[PDB]
DNA sequence: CTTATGACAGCCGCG
DNA sequence: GCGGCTGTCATAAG
């Protein structure tokens, strides 16, 4: 079969590559690769090579890679463009693999591992690695085996060997419930000391060296730990053998609160599964712990255990190991579902990049564009440095805070790529400039037509509509491929078909990101602004077009139909369209959902396309790619007192949705956005009730809402203390910690954290509050034994019995209810023009 | 990343 | 004792 790369690395004048050969064998080669870069030349010099601007270029072959780099520096000094691909690994891959790469994952060693490190003094810092590794579970995808490394004697105790037999049994039988599917795939290896285990693991590693190395938190915990441990114990010469090319680099990552270290294992591609998940799941999760994610994904989670993990090895080593196995298998189970690694393998081979560069839209697009330009002898521009400079972005209408009985929303598809394509925005496409009228003038087609020669954007930009721009071409090609591969979604292969289609979608949605990123070879401020400013007029123009149409239809005049617009959406108030027929004519809920759907399809969408073809002519664009789809139809169930929907402000609304782009729901479902019910900081029991409140407001009406309040409020004190405790994340605890006490500016949760410490001071048993970790918070009644307004303890857990009974006694229900339930509700009912209790004076609603 | 809201913390000005 | 305000910190959804 066809050859394919595995990992590629540049070291000095060499390029080191692991690859699969003609006969499926994994192997390594060192190549003294000669790069070509390109300079500009006079018309005199005749060449096949031109830059994107059609300017002639000379191909400079270099004897070695350092030459090429030294040349880029020399060229930088003179002040002349050094164009071509500066990242020689990409160039090497483009040269070596000059075809559509077809890979076979059965020949790619994917490893999932986790370690366990008994640490009795807090989280074992990986860069310090000061505690013995007492378990490694390492899964090899080729052998389909779980290789379990068990330390039997540590500083923290001696233990019996782990039992597969006991592991297989049910929890009720004293078992660990390690699944049947993996019980015959475990290879158990106990060790008498830690050096014996680490050197046996290190051999194992050379024998079965990961191409893709993954798992949950490997890049931040497991890899740094193993590395520093081996390193500290055996010296760096030994730890480096953990890379196939024996080169490793320590890298520091700065962030919000501080910096961090990762080990770059040259010749391996590390795809931490936590990072694959956060990147490609597209579901903002309240927690990213393997336990929570595995629960959300598989309805099962990580193995359960009594007491702290720090005592588990001593207390129940049997479980401790089994828990190490289950956690590695959890990741595998999630990947069996979401397919992220396969999706990474697809993208990486499609772009011809190092697989790990799937985390970089920059690196991916750059390599994709470079290749297609290479195929036509074109020379990519030098990556110039650019001052990071904020430009305007998405437009968001101020909603008038109200209730909205019938709402119908619409959506522009793939707005930003669409605009790039519609206008022809690209570096080499810039054709000039035009005198900008205020954006409002363009919105109302009142400004003078920008140009009738060039494709225009309301930010003053003008583009050639005669040339086919590099970027719009590349984004058009990815669109066309999507269709193609989602056309084989008519025909085992309904797998490679999905991942191709999903990955084209990922590239499409990631392009604008890159184009706004200053380290993009094709970044251009004038252009990025052109995209966002065009989008800003697209949306408001169509807000105008929609109002005009519906006013004309309804015989109304100057009636605000479009109630809200967020980035690529418009939400349309369909009250009057309903009134045209009249409510009593509809027989059931489904009958008016029928009516609206029909009206949008037959009357609005034609008026919308009609409206956008006008904009296209006004701006003089290359082609018309502005297409809207009807998203939601929302309202109260027929013959009910329910309000249907409400907006409390920008990105703050609830809708009672009946139909999402064609799909008609059985029961109605609440689309809630921005409101406290969608907030992780909101207590469990309260999240549940605000949602009930919103359910009752939209579907049932005021008297129902009021009934639930009076009831929930009567019944608050009996709810579990953990369910009514608000969550928060603790950051810079020390930064506000002045001798155990809240210094200037100390935020509410951190104050609570210190109050806990004050009651914790001098306790081992007590679970300490980790800096950068989620914390429960609870208000305390005035004059309490902890001497503060609040207390805050670690989340996901019950509070220590050393203070628990005094917390429960002193916690301020009144201040808790008002702060977490009532105030947010008053929020919603105020907007929806509703009362959550009777006899509320009408006069509150005024600024008297 | 940016667009945007909310919980709180001092600060200010007020007989 | 407190509303109007600028600021830090949290979280949301593209
Ligand atoms: O488009 N391609 O398919 C393509 C384009 C360029 C390619 C290759 C394969 C190599 N190169 C480039 C990269 C090198 O700098 C130069 C010569 O490549 P080579 O493999 O012929 O190396 P030589 O130095 O000639 O030695 P070799 O012939 O023994 O490998 O040409 C393939
Ligand atoms: O988005 N921009 O970056 C932007 C947008 C508009 C811009 C400029 C710079 C000028 N304009 C406006 C204001 C000018 O009156 C008009 C004409 O553009 P131009 O480039 O023709 O400017 P001139 O100085 O007239 O150039 P010329 O006399 O060489 O044609 O375009 C830049």
Beta strands A461-463; A455-457: pairing state: antiparallel
Q: Are A113 and A327 in contact, with CB atoms under 8 Å apart?
A: no
Which residues put CB within 7 Å of chain B, the nucleic strand? A 390, 392-394, 396, 532, 648-652, 674, 744-748, 751, 789, 819, 823-824, 827
C-alpha to C-alpha distance for A516 and A416, rounded to whole angstroms: 11
Q: What tokens were used for A410?
A: 């619409």
A605 lines ligand 1 (CB under 6 A): no
Which atom of ligand 2 is nearest to A461's Cα? 1
A391 lines ligand 2 (CB under 6 A): no
Ligand 2 pocket mutation, candidates A392, A433, A530, criterion most atoms within 8 A of CB: A433
CATH class of A1-107+340-382: alpha beta
Q: Calculate the angstrom distance between C1' of B1 and CA of A827.
A: 28
Q: Is A760 helix (H, G, I), strand (E, B) or coil?
A: helix
Closest CA to A354 of A276, A278, A279, A271: A271
Q: Calculate the angstrom distance between C1' of C7 and CA of A745.
A: 10
Which residues put CB within 7 Å of chain C, the nucleic strand? A 284, 286, 567, 651, 672-675, 678-681, 727-732, 735, 745, 747, 749-750, 774
Q: How many residues does chain A have?
A: 848
Q: Calculate the angstrom distance between C1' of B14 and CA of A745.
A: 25
Q: Are A604 and A596 in contact, with CB atoms under 8 Å apart?
A: no
C-alpha to C-alpha distance for A619 and A447, rounded to whole angstroms: 11
Q: Calculate the angstrom distance between C1' of C10 and CA of A739.
A: 25
Which atom of ligand 1 is nearest to A61's Cα? 15
A431 lines ligand 2 (CB under 6 A): no
Handedness of CA A545, A546, A549, A554 (dihedral sign): negative
C-alpha to C-alpha distance for A217 and A114, rounded to whole angstroms: 8
Closest CA to A630 of A656, A654, A609, A651: A609
Torsion of CA A31, A32, A33, A39, to 10 degrees: 170
Q: DSSP letter at A154?
A: E
Q: Is A10 helix (H, G, I), strand (E, B) or coil?
A: strand
A737 lines ligand 1 (CB under 6 A): no
C-alpha to C-alpha distance for A352 and A345, rounded to whole angstroms: 10
Q: If you take atom 9 of ligand 1, which residue's CA is the nearest one? A: A95
Which nucleotide is closest to the Cα of A731 by its C1'? C9
Q: What tokens were used for A298?
A: 């598989």
Ligand that lies nearest to the alpha carbon of residue A32, given by its number in the listed order: 1
C-alpha to C-alpha distance for A195 and A406, rounded to whole angstroms: 70
A98 lines ligand 1 (CB under 6 A): yes
DSSP structure string for A430-469:
EEEE--PPPHHHHHTT-SPP--SSSEEETTTEEE-SSS--
Place of tokens 């009408």: A842
For B2, which residue's CA is nearest its C1'?
Answer: A393
For B3, which residue's CA is nearest its C1'?
Answer: A394
C-alpha to C-alpha distance for A533 and A459, rounded to whole angstroms: 6
Closest CA to A179 of A164, A199, A192: A164
Give the number of other CB atoms < 10 A from CB of residue A214. Answer: 27
Q: Are A116 and A57 in contact, with CB atoms under 8 Å apart?
A: no
Give CATH for domain A383-468+518-674: 3.90.1600.10
Give residue A192 CA to ligand 2 midpoint distance, Å: 78
Could you give the C-alpha distances from A243 to A7, A223, A357, A675, A802, in angstroms and in order? 12, 11, 18, 49, 48
Contacts of A707 by beta carbon, 8 Å cutoff, 6+ apart: none
Closest CA to A399 of A676, A687, A674, A700: A674
C-alpha to C-alpha distance for A631 and A754, rounded to whole angstroms: 48
A460 lines ligand 2 (CB under 6 A): yes
Give the 3-state secondary structure of A633-674.
EECCCCCCCCCCEEEEECCEEEEEEEEECCEEEEEEEEEEEC
Contacts of A86 by beta carbon, 8 Å cutoff, 6+ apart: A37, A72, A382, A383
Q: Is A594 helix (H, G, I), strand (E, B) or coil?
A: helix
Query: Which residues sit directly before a break in chain A (C to N > 2.5 Å)?
Result: 491
C-alpha to C-alpha distance for A327 and A329, rounded to whole angstroms: 5
First-to-last C-alpha distance (Å) of chain A: 81
A95 lines ligand 1 (CB under 6 A): yes
C-alpha to C-alpha distance for A286 and A580, rounded to whole angstroms: 44
Give the number of other CB atoms < 10 A from CB of residue A575. Answer: 18
CATH class of A722-812: alpha beta
Q: Are A352 and A103 in contact, with CB atoms under 8 Å apart?
A: no
Q: What tokens were used for A395?
A: 């437009």
Give residue A435 CA to ligand 2 midpoint distance, Å: 6
Q: Calculate the angstrom distance between C1' of C8 and CA of A256.
A: 13
For B1, which residue's CA is nearest its C1'?
Answer: A513
Pick among 3.40.190.290, 3.40.50.1370, 3.40.50.12780, 3.30.420.10: CATH of A108-339: 3.30.420.10
Give residue A367 CA to ligand 1 midpoint distance, Å: 19
Q: Are A374 and A94 in contact, with CB atoms under 8 Å apart?
A: yes
Bases along strand C below 7 A from a protein CB: 8-14
Give residue A434 CA to ligand 2 midpoint distance, Å: 6
C-alpha to C-alpha distance for A677 and A655, rounded to whole angstroms: 13
Q: Calculate the angstrom distance between C1' of B6 and CA of A185.
A: 51
Q: Calculate the angstrom distance between C1' of C9 and CA of A1.
A: 57
Give the number of other CB atoms < 10 A from CB of residue A254. Answer: 8
Q: Would you say domain A675-721+813-848 falls under CATH 1.10.3230.20?
A: no
Q: Calculate the angstrom distance between C1' of C1 and CA of A398.
A: 33
Place of tokens 């463009």: A81
Q: Are A592 and A578 in contact, with CB atoms under 8 Å apart?
A: yes
A377 lines ligand 1 (CB under 6 A): no
């Amino acid at each position: 079969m066809k050859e394919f790369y595995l990992t590629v690395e540049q070291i000095g004048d060499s390029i080191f590559e692991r690859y699969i050969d003609s006969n499926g064998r994994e192997r390594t080669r060192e190549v003294e690769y000669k790069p070509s870069l390109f300079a500009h030349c006079p018309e005199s010099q005749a060449t096949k090579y031109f830059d994107i601007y059609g300017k002639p270029c000379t191909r400079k072959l270099f004897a070695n890679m350092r030459d090429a780099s030294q040349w880029i520096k020399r060229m930088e000094d003179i002040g002349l463009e050094a164009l071509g691909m500066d990242d020689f690994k990409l160039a090497y891959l483009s040269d070596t693999y000059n075809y559509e790469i077809k890979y076979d994952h059965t020949k790619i060693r994917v490893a999932n591992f986790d370690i366990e490190v008994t640490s009795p003094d807090g989280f074992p810092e990986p860069s310090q690695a000061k505690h013995p590794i007492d378990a490694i579970t390492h899964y090899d995808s080729i052998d389909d085996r779980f290789y379990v490394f068990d330390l039997l004697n540590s500083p923290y105790g001696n233990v019996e060997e782990w039992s597969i037999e006991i592991a297989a049994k049910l929890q009720e039988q004293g078992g660990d419930e390690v699944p049947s599917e993996i019980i015959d795939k475990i290879i158990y290896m106990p060790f008498d000391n830690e050096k014996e285990l680490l050197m046996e693991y290190l051999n194992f590693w050379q024998q079965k060296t990961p191409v893709i190395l993954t798992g949950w938190n490997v890049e931040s915990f497991a890899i740094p730990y193993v590395y520093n441990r081996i390193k500290n114990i055996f010296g760096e010469s030994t730890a480096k053998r953990l890379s196939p090319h024996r080169k490793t680099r320590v890298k520091v990552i700065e962030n919000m609160y501080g910096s961090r270290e990762i080990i770059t294992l040259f010749g391996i591609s590390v795809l931490d599964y936590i990072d694959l998940y956060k990147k490609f799941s597209f579901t903002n999760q309240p927690s990213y712990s393997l336990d929570y994610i595995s629960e959300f994904e598989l309805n099962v989670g990580k193995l359960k255990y009594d007491g702290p993990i720090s005592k588990l090895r001593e207390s129940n080593h049997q479980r401790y190991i089994s828990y190490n196995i289950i956690a590695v298998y959890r990741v595998l189970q999630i990947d069996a579902k979401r397919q992220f690694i396969n999706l990474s393998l697809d993208m990486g081979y499609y772009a011809k990049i190092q697989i790990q560069s799937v985390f970089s839209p920059i690196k991916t697009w750059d390599a994709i564009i470079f290749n297609s330009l290479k195929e036509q002898n074109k020379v990519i521009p030098q990556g110039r440095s650019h001052p990071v400079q904020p430009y305007p972005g998405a437009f968001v209408k101020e909603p008038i805070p109200n209730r909205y009985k019938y709402v119908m929303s619409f959506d522009l598809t793939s707005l930003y790529p669409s605009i790039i394509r519609q206008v022809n925005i690209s570096p080499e496409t810039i054709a000039g400039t035009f005198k900008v009228a205020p954006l409002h003038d363009y919105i109302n087609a009142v400004a003078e037509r920008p140009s009738d020669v060039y494709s225009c954007s309301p930010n003053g930009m003008m583009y050639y509509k005669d040339r086919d721009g590099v970027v719009p071409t590349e984004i058009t090609k990815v669109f066309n491929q999507r269709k193609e591969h989602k056309g084989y979604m008519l025909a085992r292969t309904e797998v490679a078909g999905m991942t191709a289609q999903i990955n084209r979608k990922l590239l499409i949605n990631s392009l604008y990101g890159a184009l706004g990123n200053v380290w993009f070879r094709y970044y251009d401020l004038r252009n990025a602004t052109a995209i966002t400013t065009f989008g800003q007029m697209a949306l408001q123009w169509i807000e105008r077009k929609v109002n005009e149409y519906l006013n004309e239809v309804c015989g109304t005049e100057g009636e605000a139909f479009v109630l809200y617009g967020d980035t690529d959406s418009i939400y349309v108030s369909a009250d009057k369209i309903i009134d045209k027929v009249g409510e009593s004519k509809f027989r059931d809920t489904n009958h008016w959902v029928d009516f609206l759907d029909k009206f949008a399809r037959e009357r609005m969408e034609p008026a919308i396309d009609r409206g956008f073809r006008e904009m296209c002519e006004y701006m003089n664009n290359k082609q018309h790619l502005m297409f809207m789809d009807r998203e939601a139809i929302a309202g109260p169930p027929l013959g009910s007192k329910g309000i249907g929907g409400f907006w409390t402000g920008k990105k703050r609304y609830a809708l009672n949705v009946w139909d999402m782009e064609g799909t008609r729901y059985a029961e109605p479902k609440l689309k809630i956005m921005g409101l406290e019910t969608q907030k992780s900081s909101t207590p469990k029991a309260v999240q549940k009730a605000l949602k009930e409140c919103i359910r009752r407001m939209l579907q049932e009406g005021e008297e129902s809402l009021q009934e639930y309040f009076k009831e929930f409020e009567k019944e608050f004190r009996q709810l579990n203390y953990i369910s009514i405790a608000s969550v928060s994340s603790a950051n810079n605890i020390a930064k506000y910690d002045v001798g155990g006490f809240p210094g200037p500016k100390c935020p509410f949760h951190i104050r609570g954290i210190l109050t806990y410490n004050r009651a914790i001071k001098g306790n081992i048993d007590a679970p300490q509050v980790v800096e950068g970790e989620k914390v429960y918070v609870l208000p305390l009644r005035e004059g309490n034994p902890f001497g503060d307004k609040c207390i805050a303890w670690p989340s996901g857990t019950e509070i220590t019995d050393l203070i628990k009974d005094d917390v429960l006694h002193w916690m301020d229900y009144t201040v808790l209810l008002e702060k977490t339930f009532i105030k947010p509700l008053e929020g919603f009912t105020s907007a929806a023009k509703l009362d959550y209790e009777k006899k509320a004076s009408l006069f509150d609603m005024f600024d008297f």
